[PDB]
Amino acid sequence: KCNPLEKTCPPNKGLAASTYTADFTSASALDQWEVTAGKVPVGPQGAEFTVAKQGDAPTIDTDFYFFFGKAEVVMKAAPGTGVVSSIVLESDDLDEVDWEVLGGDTTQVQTNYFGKGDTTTYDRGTYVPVATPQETFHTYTIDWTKDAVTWSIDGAVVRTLTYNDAKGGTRFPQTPMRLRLGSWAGGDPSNPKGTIEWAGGLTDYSAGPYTMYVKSVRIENANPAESYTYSDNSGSWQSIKFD
Ligand SMILES: CC(=O)N[C@@H]1[C@@H](O)[C@H](O[C@@H]2O[C@H](CO)[C@@H](O[C@@H]3O[C@H](CO)[C@@H](O[C@@H]4O[C@H](CO)[C@@H](O)[C@H](O)[C@H]4NC(C)=O)[C@H](O)[C@H]3NC(C)=O)[C@H](O)[C@H]2NC(C)=O)[C@@H](CO)O[C@H]1O
Ligand SMILES: CC(=O)N[C@@H]1[C@@H](O)[C@H](O[C@@H]2O[C@H](CO)[C@@H](O)[C@H](O)[C@H]2NC(C)=O)[C@@H](CO)O[C@H]1O
């Protein structure tokens, strides 16, 4: 994880196709993914992100990066107090767009972003109404262009971030991003008071295994390439070299 605003890092492996599809009911679905933590079994309901015990943070990263386009995930959130179901887009410069569902909040899901790992205040967050995310599969779409990031649920736009809303684009996500899917306990007793408070309370690991399900992943690469290179330390999209 070398940050190109701080130094010169090697190229990011890119998705050299205009679309990527993963149906997680097949075994060879994690061929272009890495299991970064825990075990992630593949079931009849798709890939399973289970918080069974303390420290369980099962995550999968794509091997590839994409430079603008679409990320669509069909997910059922994990239940349980303090359990976080996360759909994360992140670049090496720490540009990020994400979706977070909390097990005890049955009426909403959170949308969030940051530019260049800048979490000056936690004012980049938005709660949007969703019907029983822990009991119903929903399609979480992020549309990503130079002009705006759009968050949609089951084909309905629920949030738009334009380039200038991100401090005139100084904090807009515009660098090659990999998709991470995972569940973790934000209510882990060992987290800061503020994280446990945010996650909607403490996690009772005894009270069940809590499973997050991802049936499918759809990625559209607006700029298909074998690799992406950060030319400068500007962290801007104009500084991304590829062919
Ligand atoms: C700035 C910001 O707000 N960023 C958010 C992201 O943090 C967040 O992604 C999730 O973040 C959590 C908390 O950091 C993370 O959970 C942690 O995962 C790591 C690795 O799996 C664990 O660290 C390891 O712990 C083991 C113990 O089993 C050690 O042996 C090992 O040495 C540790 N390794 C390292 C490198 O530290 C933590 O234990 C674990 N914490 C908990 C409480 O479970 C999630 O995995 C992140 N999830 C995803 C999908 O990225 C993101 C999503 O909510 O949102 C951003 O806003
Ligand atoms: C110690 C600390 O930073 N505590 C609180 C924050 O954790 C919390 O922000 C939330 O952090 C999570 C990652 O650990 C994110 O997944 C989550 O999206 C993020 N929430 C927001 C709104 O960005 C905030 C929440 O208000 O409170 C801090 O005090």
Author numbering: 24 to 266
How do the authors describe this structure?
Using soluble chitin derivatives as oligoglycosyl donor and oligosaccharides derived from chitin and β-1,3-glucan as acceptors, A. fumigatus Crh enzymes act as transglycosylases for formation of chitin–chitin and chitin–glucan crosslinks both in vitro and in vivo. AfCrh5 adopts the GH16 family β-jelly-roll fold composed of two stacked seven-stranded β-sheets with a convex and a concave face. AfCrh5 shares the general EXDXE active site motif present in most GH16 family enzymes in which the first glutamate, the middle aspartate and the last glutamate act as the catalytic nucleophile, the auxiliary residue, and the general acid/base, respectively. In AfCrh5, Glu119 and Glu123 are predicted to act as the nucleophile and the general acid/base, respectively.
